[PDB]
Design an enzyme around this catalytic site. Structure first.
Site, PDB file in Angstrom:
ATOM      1  N   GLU A  11       0.777  -1.202   0.000  1.00 33.09           N
ATOM      2  CA  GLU A  11       0.000   0.000   0.000  1.00 33.09           C
ATOM      3  C   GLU A  11       0.807   1.247   0.000  1.00 33.09           C
ATOM      4  O   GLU A  11       0.326   2.311  -0.376  1.00 33.09           O
ATOM      5  CB  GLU A  11      -0.904   0.006   1.235  1.00 33.09           C
ATOM      6  N   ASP A  20      -7.149   6.112  -4.574  1.00 37.89           N
ATOM      7  CA  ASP A  20      -6.695   4.733  -4.636  1.00 37.89           C
ATOM      8  C   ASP A  20      -6.903   4.060  -6.008  1.00 37.89           C
ATOM      9  O   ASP A  20      -7.206   4.708  -7.008  1.00 37.89           O
ATOM     10  CB  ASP A  20      -7.237   3.865  -3.483  1.00 37.89           C
TER      11      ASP A  20
END
Length: 164
Positions: A11, A20
């Site tokens: 991440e 995202d």
């Protein structure tokens, strides 16, 4: 390697709100803020999370604590789950992270629908589980990460994270 590291690898870290993989607003180490298209919605959410007026930016420290919470929520979720708890329980240390990873990225529910794979994972029919997982929307939307996760499930090692 631990589940935390693995995640941190997948991440990354950002201290300013960002979008995202599916265009949603996140911050820090992939902590999701809102699915709403609103950025005010996002700052607001974040301010509430953090305990202050962030204006959209946070500290390394705050990110880390969100991460920790985030991780905690995943496992908790795996555990409350009638369908994954059993799977989890039967996993070895490394694959266990893989599952956590999966849950962190998409949620308990999403993950709980991996019906057959879950079975196979439970049975330890890796190569089979792997194939099956590849055939998912998950795998389609995030190929690179999927491979890593799946590969983990497959080998049970941290070879796919070699270069993290």
């Amino acid at each position: 390697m631990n589940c935390f590291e693995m995640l941190r690898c997948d991440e990354g870290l950002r201290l300013k709100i960002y979008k995202d993989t599916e265009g949603y607003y996140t911050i820090g180490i992939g902590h999701l803020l809102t699915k709403s298209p609103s950025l005010n919605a996002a700052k607001s959410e974040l301010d509430k999370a953090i305990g202050r007026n962030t204006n959209g930016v946070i500290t390394k420290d705050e990110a880390e604590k969100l991460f920790n919470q985030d991780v905690d929520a995943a496992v908790r979720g795996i555990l409350r789950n009638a369908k994954l708890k059993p799977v989890y329980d039967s996993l070895d240390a490394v694959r266990r992270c893989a599952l956590i990873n999966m849950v962190f990225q998409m949620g308990e529910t999403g993950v709980a629908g991996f019906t057959n794979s879950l079975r196979m994972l439970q049975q330890k029919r890796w190569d089979e589980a792997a194939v099956n997982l590849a055939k998912s929307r998950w795998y389609n939307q995030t190929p690179n990460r999927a491979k890593r996760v799946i590969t983990t499930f497959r080998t049970g090692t941290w070879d796919a994270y070699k270069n993290c």
